[PDB]
């Protein structure tokens, strides 16, 4: 159904994952180093194309 | 709720109620409540004009077989048990040979009661409760219990001569598993679907033929109550498996003369070359002894849970578990008489003795029938 | 012959090539008439082909196939209580289902396999016939009739082979019911072989703690009585002899805890051998080593049965793990909360040796969290690590807070609203936040209640309450019962014991009343206040700034935090006044919540609920008339209306009470009835005895997915409120409540609905015993 | 402040004094790890230093402590057993 | 909702009810073309269209099930990158999403148990199909799919600094270090392990962590 006042767009919802860009990289100083890239959360950011988030095409 | 959570069995009625040779009672001589609704192998015995009858609550009687009056009326209100004067729960039937009313109780005990007074001249423990009437013969008291054991108790004094395992009913596969002594072997079936000869002198398996299966791969139900105990005629073991699979095989070798080894036979007798038998439809059919050639059949008592088809008063007699007695043609299946002397029904095979028909119903206990 | 083409005729789950590769006469291979005969069987070896007719045009094959892919539906009939999915599973065990290829070989594999399924349910008296009903293009339907005769019920187990530890007490640990004649129906006694399997081991533990270390069951043999219900089990057993737990030989890796492990294995040497205590003394050591950091405490008592003196000796072989095991823990399943909200609910601390109790009590705080649905964990070993096990607490959370309201109708008057909402565990914080209040055309009410449950991490629970009631009742003005009440009560929760937990508070009750009702009991307490307010008018004022001290006690012997089923919680809360209060009194109240399962399935559960209170003056004064007890509908005695149960006041001979509105809210005033007029409202008494009697019940049509979150509960709710200081002289021709027996009663059923906003309880209830001044709305809904 | 007594806060992960006697300077990590297992904390930027460090406060009456580090070399051969008492 | 036709008319209903936006209608036709006929030629495209029906109907468990009905039955389509797009995006919204985010109500303190999956399924996109048409959208999600997985570990790292479990601080922070190499909350986790060490009397190790902050200031 719809509102009898026929009004929508009163909220924006959650879309925060759509826009996240890699933050300031950590530079471990020598002798104090920790290997920060052991997990996969050092993201394999690769060369692929298209728009961002969910707005890109869904067949 | 519980009106809907419970369920029921299905049966069929009994057509052709007849009174042509008008059936009466010879005398009605009730003990109490006898075999009960649980299937026990308790059947009374008649000897010396005295129906030595009993019920599982304890009261063992001596019905003087002219009116069935108690010559002695003692109780097997239990003495070893687990409580003094417990009910007897006579799992084995009333055997009377000599001065002992041998009755196997559910305390794995065969009380042998002195037939002059019914007092326990001996009792002897067996292994497990009795699937079999105590077959007292040849110095032995032979029981095939529910654990497959051939317990040989001493006949006149009471002593376990040997207890040997047989065809073993894995559950209490209810039915006459009994050892019958034949040609020197206690030739015995066993309620898991075999038949066998077991040397009667010490309990030595002469042969055992797997006739059919039970509790697996030919699955038998809760209503499955089929004797495998042999009725040996002409040196031929005429017997069944536990699913009713009828067979005819050699007595001391086990070699199959013929078979109906697909059968649904519940009770059976070999009347000459007319093997009168109760199938799982609780119906009478005559089969041959060179085969299972149906000389005649009858379903005029369909799903009326028959006793063994016996001969009395000139007709083929069989009772049921609905209290109907029947007088079948010994040829093709005509009710010549029908007596509903009880309605609780006859968990005993009819003791057609003293020229009468001494029948013990489950709760409408012992009557005697004439026509 | 060599095929140049194959006519593939009808596949519907098979490919053209998948037929072709199944053909040994595939297009290009040789064709022989035996190879044609090798093709009918191998296309039958596809399992999807109902009939296959491999023919040929010389060598060019024409393969006429009838096939049995997708079963378009499967029809169930004759299943009164067994569900179709139970009948679907053994059908699925025979390799057929809807939308899948039928196999006509598996027709009876459904049926007897369902009878073998019927064999397991306490039946065997059952037949099935899988009727293949064909549908278009190849399709089929498995019409399944269910000719189930009758299931079995336990009748009489005949235990054989014991006479020295008699059979009659070995029957004593079973239970069944009787008497279903269609007019006196009680219970059922259905037989289960798996229950019977549990029955025989209960017989084993029956023997084992007596000394019987040679007890054994020889055989077990159930009757095939021809009644198709008769269960009579020939259980040959060997009772054995009694033995004596005569000495402990505790050994192995005691992990440096040799004394306290031996304290767990303290016996009476020569006690009649208790194998259950022997079992108990083993995992006694396991909890000890588990609390001592050993997650793998392999303990093995060997009761070496010393028949030579009819004793046993207890060879205990113990193997703990290594020193620590809690490296870290994980929290999973907290999609609406922070992990620290449940880490403050947990007591096993990382960077320590493992405390097994420290896990479970923290899980028990999670079991009493209420914003959970289950508390489970994954106490997984860090592999290759004798000091590390990581405990992934995968729990399931639950929704937070609930709304409440009490208005009758909106947009029908001025600016007027009734509020009230909960955000306990606020956005995942643990903060018990519930705020109500109402600014209306009769009052302006605000009330706040917040809790910091973890002011410290010891269970120190900083809970504060505020309220401000600008309430005048505004019939025309202040003239009809102003009661401006405001104040606070800030409290602290703390476990002295975590079962026996203490409560205390301080009640600042600043009341500002004017033109109170002319009721006799209303002025009666004000006569005990030292005032003498006017009977003839509502013109009198009452400012009491009561400085009171509250107290209470928590008992916590009940399982869950959101849906309990077994145990009891006792909840004391009382109060007293201090020097400085504007009235010197006390008032004590206590409630309990006992949960007893009727059957031990915990879905038939007695809910023990009662409410009792009492108050009086500390000396020379009275527990105030605004502290009188009430009851009625929308309560634990519901089916009445709100505030209907209690003592009943009487309006004095009354006049224009700063203008009582002209023939409106007539309170014996100048608007008629100028006399000692009976007031049917609940003035309430200084004591209370009311209760609720409800039962948790299963529901067979509401799914037990949520018939265990919908608590269907009938009640016969009764109760009375009375005044131990009631003037039977002031109310001689009126309701007198000096008697404690003023019984009201309303019976009905409440319907709890666990919404996304939590449990929602609605009810209908008819009063079948009432008393003075009860207003009754039989439909009582509680948001 | 004015607190008479508080419920305590504990944190284990420590070697006992028995655990110091099982080990020695020169000992491989694994001979420590056979009797004393793994630490629940080690050195993430330096050599093999097995931190076995205890924390506890006795109810706002000060605070107790037992730091016990095992500075092995890079080969896991133990070079220092630094037992540190209450801070 | 399905007329019993050959599956192409059932596809013809399905693709039109995709264009209707009636996924409720479209799912029924997209399924029951393949239920009574499990040999649809567009079945891999149906398994694309089913997620396109499911995700636009917000049927994220069914969209994940249509992935399995894609991958197990017909992954012959090289829209596995689309499926790896429609998996790392499907586990994304199924982890932690609400209408409360108009003014900033917290959702990263919650369990990222399915955002753990949404990282890896987008990590299967940017690895198994690194040049694909969907790696760029994944990369934008993947950063939140590390950092919300970081900030939850930070949310565990913060409480042990509050509780006093200073070993558990160092276990939380250096794990957050070694997993998340660029998240700022890892630099916010950073002084806790240092301040754990000063409470644990490893101030030499802490000053080393203070040297880490000196070069993670960059």
Swiss-Prot record, chain C:
GO terms for cellular component: Bam protein complex. This is Outer membrane protein assembly factor BamA. PANTHER family: OUTER MEMBRANE PROTEIN ASSEMBLY FACTOR BAMA, SORTING AND ASSEMBLY MACHINERY SAMM50 PROTEIN FAMILY MEMBER. Part of the Bam complex, which is composed of the outer membrane protein BamA, and four lipoproteins BamB, BamC, BamD and BamE. Transmembrane segments: none annotated. It comes from Escherichia coli O45:K1 (strain S88 / ExPEC). Pfam families: Omp85 (PF01103), POTRA (PF07244). Coiled coil: none annotated. Belongs to the BamA family.
UniProtKB/Swiss-Prot annotation, chain D:
The keyword Methyltransferase does not apply. GO terms for cellular component: Bam protein complex. One of its GO terms (biological process) is protein insertion into membrane. It is a lipid-anchor. It is found in: Cell outer membrane. Keywords: Cell outer membrane, Lipoprotein, Membrane, Palmitate, Signal. One of its GO terms (molecular function) is protein-macromolecule adaptor activity. Part of the outer membrane protein assembly complex, which is involved in assembly and insertion of beta-barrel proteins into the outer membrane. Belongs to the BamE family. Part of the Bam complex, which is composed of the outer membrane protein BamA, and four lipoproteins BamB, BamC, BamD and BamE. This is Outer membrane protein assembly factor BamE. The gene is bamE. The chain holds residues 24 to 110 of 113 of the full protein.
From Swiss-Prot, chain E:
The keyword Transmembrane helix does not apply. It is found in: Cell outer membrane. One of its GO terms (cellular component) is Bam protein complex. It comes from the Bacteria. It is a lipid-anchor. Its main location: membrane. Keywords: Cell outer membrane, Lipoprotein, Membrane, Palmitate, Signal. Gene3D superfamilies: Tetratricopeptide repeat domain. The keyword Membrane applies. GO terms for biological process: Gram-negative-bacterium-type cell outer membrane assembly; protein insertion into membrane. Part of the Bam complex, which is composed of the outer membrane protein BamA, and four lipoproteins BamB, BamC, BamD and BamE. Part of the outer membrane protein assembly complex, which is involved in assembly and insertion of beta-barrel proteins into the outer membrane. Constitutes, with BamA, the core component of the assembly machinery. Belongs to the BamD family. This is Outer membrane protein assembly factor BamD. It comes from Escherichia coli O157:H7. The lineage of its organism: Bacteria, Pseudomonadati, Pseudomonadota, Gammaproteobacteria, Enterobacterales.
């Amino acid at each position: 159904c719809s509102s009898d006042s026929r009004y929508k767009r009163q909220v924006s919802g959650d879309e925060a994952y759509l826009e996240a860009a890699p933050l300031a990289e950590l530079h471990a100083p020598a002798g104090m180093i920790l290997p920060v890239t052991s997990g996969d959360y050092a993201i394999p950011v690769t060369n692929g194309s298209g728009a961002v988030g969910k707005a890109l095409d869904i067949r | 709720l519980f009106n809907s959570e419970e369920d029921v069995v299905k049966m069929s009625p009994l057509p052709t109620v007849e009174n042509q040779f008008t059936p009466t009672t010879a005398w009605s001589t009730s003990v109490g409540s006898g075999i009960g609704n649980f299937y026990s192998n308790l059947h009374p015995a008649l000897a010396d004009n005295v129906v030595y009858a009993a019920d599982r609550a304890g009261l063992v009687k001596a019905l003087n077989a002219d009116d069935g009056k108690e010559i002695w009326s003692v109780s097997l209100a239990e003495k070893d048990g687990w409580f003094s004067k417990e009910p007897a729960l006579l799992s084995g039937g009333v055997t009377v040979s000599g001065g002992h009313v041998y009755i196997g109780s559910e305390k794995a005990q065969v009380y042998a009661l002195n037939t002059s007074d019914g007092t326990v001249a001996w009792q002897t423990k067996v292994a497990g409760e009795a699937l079999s009437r105590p077959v007292v013969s040849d110095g032995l008291v032979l029981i095939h219990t529910s654990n497959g054991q051939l317990q040989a108790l001493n006949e006149a004094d009471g002593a376990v001569k040997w207890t040997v395992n047989l065809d073993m009913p894995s559950l209490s596969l209810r039915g006459e598993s009994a050892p019958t002594t034949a040609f020197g072997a206690a030739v015995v079936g066993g309620d898991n679907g075999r038949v066998s000869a077991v040397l009667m002198e010490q309990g030595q398996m002469i042969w055992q033929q797997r006739i059919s299966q039970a509790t697996g791969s030919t699955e038998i139900d809760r209503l499955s109550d089929v004797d495998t105990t042999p009725v040996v005629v002409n040196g031929v073991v005429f017997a069944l498996a536990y699913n009713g699979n009828l067979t005819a095989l050699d007595l001391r070798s086990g070699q199959i003369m013929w078979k109906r080894e697909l059968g649904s036979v519940n009770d059976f007798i070999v009347d000459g070359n007319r093997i009168y038998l109760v199938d799982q439809n609780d119906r009478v059919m005559a089969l041959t002894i060179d085969g299972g050639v149906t000389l005649w059949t009858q379903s005029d008592l369909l799903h009326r849970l028959l006793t063994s088809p016996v001969l009395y008063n000139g007709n083929l007699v069989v009772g049921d578990s609905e209290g109907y007695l029947h007088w079948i043609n010994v040829e093709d299946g005509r009710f010549v008489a029908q007596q509903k002397v009880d309605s609780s029904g006859f968990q005993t095979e009819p003791v057609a003795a003293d020229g009468k028909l001494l029948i013990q119903a489950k709760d409408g206990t012992v009557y005697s029938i004439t026509r | 012959f060599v095929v140049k083409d194959i006519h593939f005729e009808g596949l519907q789950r098979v490919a053209v090539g998948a037929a072709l590769l199944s053909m040994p006469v595939r297009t290009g291979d040789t064709v022989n008439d035996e190879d044609i005969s090798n093709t009918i069987r191998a296309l039958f070896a596809t399992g999807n082909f109902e009939d296959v007719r491999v023919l040929r045009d010389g060598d060019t094959l024409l393969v006429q196939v009838k096939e049995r892919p997708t079963i378009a539906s499967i029809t169930f009939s004759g299943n009164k209580s067994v569900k179709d999915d139970m009948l679907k599973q053994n059908l699925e065990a025979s390799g057929v289902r809807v939308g899948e290829s039928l196999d006509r070989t598996t027709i009876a594999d459904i049926e007897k396999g369902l009878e073998d399924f019927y064999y397991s349910v306490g039946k065997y008296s059952a037949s099935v016939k899988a009727v293949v009903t064909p549908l278009p293009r190849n399709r089929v339907d498995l019409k399944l009739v269910f000719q189930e005769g009758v299931s079995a019920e336990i009748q009489q187990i005949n235990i054989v082979g014991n006479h020295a530890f008699t059979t009659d007490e070995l029957i004593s640990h079973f239970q069944l019911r009787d008497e279903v004649p269609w007019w006196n129906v009680v219970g059922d006694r259905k037989y289960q072989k798996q229950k019977l399997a549990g029955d025989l081991e209960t017989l084993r533990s029956y023997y084992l703690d007596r000394g019987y270390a040679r007890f054994n069951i020889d055989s077990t043999q159930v009757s095939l009585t021809p009644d198709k219900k008769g269960i009579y089990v020939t259980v040959n057993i060997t009772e054995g002899d009694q033995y004596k737990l005569s000495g402990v030989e505790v050994s192995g890796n005691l992990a440096g805890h040799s004394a306290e492990i031996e304290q767990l294995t303290k016996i009476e040497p020569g006690e009649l051998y208790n194998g259950t205590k022997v079992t108990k003394m083993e995992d006694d050591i396991k909890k000890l080593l588990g609390r001592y950091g050993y997650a793998y405490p392999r303990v093995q008592s060997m009761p070496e049965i010393n028949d030579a003196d009819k004793t046993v000796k207890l060879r205990v072989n113990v193997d703990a793990g290594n020193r620590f095991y809690v490296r870290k823990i994980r929290f999973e399943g907290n999609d609406t909360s922070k992990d620290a909200v449940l880490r403050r609910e947990m007591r096993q601390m990382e960077g320590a040796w493992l405390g097994s109790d420290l896990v479970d009590q923290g899980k028990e705080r999670l079991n009493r969290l209420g914003f959970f649905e289950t508390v489970d964990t994954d106490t997984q070993r860090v592999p290759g690590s004798p000091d590390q096990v990581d405990v992934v607490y995968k729990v399931k959370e639950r929704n937070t807070g609930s709304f409440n309201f009490g208005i009758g109708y909106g947009t029908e008057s001025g600016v007027s609203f009734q509020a009230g909402v909960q955000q306990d565990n606020w956005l995942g914080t643990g903060y018990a936040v519930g705020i109500n209040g109402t600014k209306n055309d009769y009052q302006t009410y605000a009330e706040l209640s917040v809790t910091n449950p973890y002011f410290t991490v010891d269970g120190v629970s900083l809970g504060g309450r505020l309220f401000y009631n600008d309430f005048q009742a505004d019939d025309a003005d202040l003239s009809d019962y102003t009661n401006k009440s405001y104040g606070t009560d800030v409290t602290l929760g703390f476990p002295i014991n975590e079962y026996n937990s203490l409560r205390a508070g301080l009640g600042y009750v600043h009341n500002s009343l004017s033109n109170m009702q002319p009721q006799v009991a209303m002025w009666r307490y004000l006569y005990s206040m030292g005032e003498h307010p006017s009977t003839s008018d509502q013109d009198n004022s009452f400012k009491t700034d009561d400085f009171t001290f509250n107290y209470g006690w928590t008992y916590n012997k009940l399982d869950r935090g959101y849906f309990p089923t077994d145990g009891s919680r006792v909840n004391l809360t009382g109060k007293v006044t201090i020097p400085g209060s504007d009235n010197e009194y006390y008032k004590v109240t206590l409630d309990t919540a006992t949960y007893v399962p009727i059957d031990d399935d915990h879905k038939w559960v007695v809910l023990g609920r009662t409410r009792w209170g009492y108050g009086d003056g500390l000396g020379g004064k009275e527990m105030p008339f605004y502290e009188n007890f009430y009851a009625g509908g929308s309560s634990t005695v519901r089916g009445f209306q709100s505030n209907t149960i209690g003592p009943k006041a009487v309006y004095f001979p009354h006049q224009a009470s700063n203008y009582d509105p002209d023939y409106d809210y007539e309170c014996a005033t100048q608007d008629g009835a100028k006399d000692l007029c009976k007031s049917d409202d609940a003035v309430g008494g200084n004591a209370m005895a009311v209760a609720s009697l409800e039962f948790i019940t299963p529901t067979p049509f509401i799914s037990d997915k949520y018939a265990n979150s919908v608590r269907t509960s009938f009640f016969w709710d009764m109760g009375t409120v009375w005044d131990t200081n009631w003037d039977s002289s002031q109310y001689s021709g009126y309701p007198d409540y000096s008697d404690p027996s003023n019984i009201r009663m309303s019976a009905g059923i409440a319907l709890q609905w666990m919404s996304p906003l939590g449990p929602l309880v609605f009810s209908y209830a008819q009063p079948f015993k009432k008393y003075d001044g009860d207003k009754a709305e039989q439909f009582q809904f509680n948001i | 402040e004015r607190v008479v007594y508080r419920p305590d806060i504990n944190q284990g992960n420590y070697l006992t004094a028995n655990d110091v006697s099982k080990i020695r300077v020169g000992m491989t990590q694994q001979q420590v790890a056979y009797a004393l297992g793994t630490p629940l904390m080690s050195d993430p930027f330096g050599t093999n230093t097995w931190f076995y460090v205890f924390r506890q406060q006795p109810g706002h009456e000060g605070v107790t402590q037992q730091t016990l580090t095992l500075t092995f070399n890079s080969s896991g051969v133990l070079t220092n057993i630094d037992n540190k008492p209450a801070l | 909702e399905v007329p019993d036709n050959p599956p192409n008319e059932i596809y013809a209903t399905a693709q039109q009810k995709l264009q209707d936006g009636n996924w409720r209608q479209a799912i029924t036709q997209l399924e029951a073309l393949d239920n009574r006929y499990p040999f649809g030629p567009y079945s891999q495209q149906v398994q694309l269209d089913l997620i396109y029906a499911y995700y636009k109907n917000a049927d994220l468990p069914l969209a994940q099930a249509a992935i399995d009905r894609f991958i197990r039955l017909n992954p012959t389509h090289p829209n596995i990158d689309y499926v790896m797009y429609m998996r790392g995006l499907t586990n994304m919204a199924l982890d932690d999403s609400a209408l409360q985010g108009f003014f900033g109500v917290d959702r990263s303190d919650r369990d990222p148990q399915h955002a753990r999956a949404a990282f890896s399924d987008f990590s299967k996109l940017v690895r198994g199909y690194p040049n694909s048409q969907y790696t760029t959208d994944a990369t934008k999600r993947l950063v939140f799919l590390k950092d919300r997985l970081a900030k939850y570990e930070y949310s565990v790292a913060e409480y042990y600094t509050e509780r006093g479990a200073w070993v558990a601080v160092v276990n939380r922070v250096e794990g957050m270090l070694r997993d998340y190499p660029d998240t700022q909350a890892t630099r916010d986790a950073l002084p806790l392990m240092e301040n754990a060490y000063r409470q644990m009397q490893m101030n030499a190790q802490a000053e080393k962590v203070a040297k880490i902050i000196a070069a993670n200031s960059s």
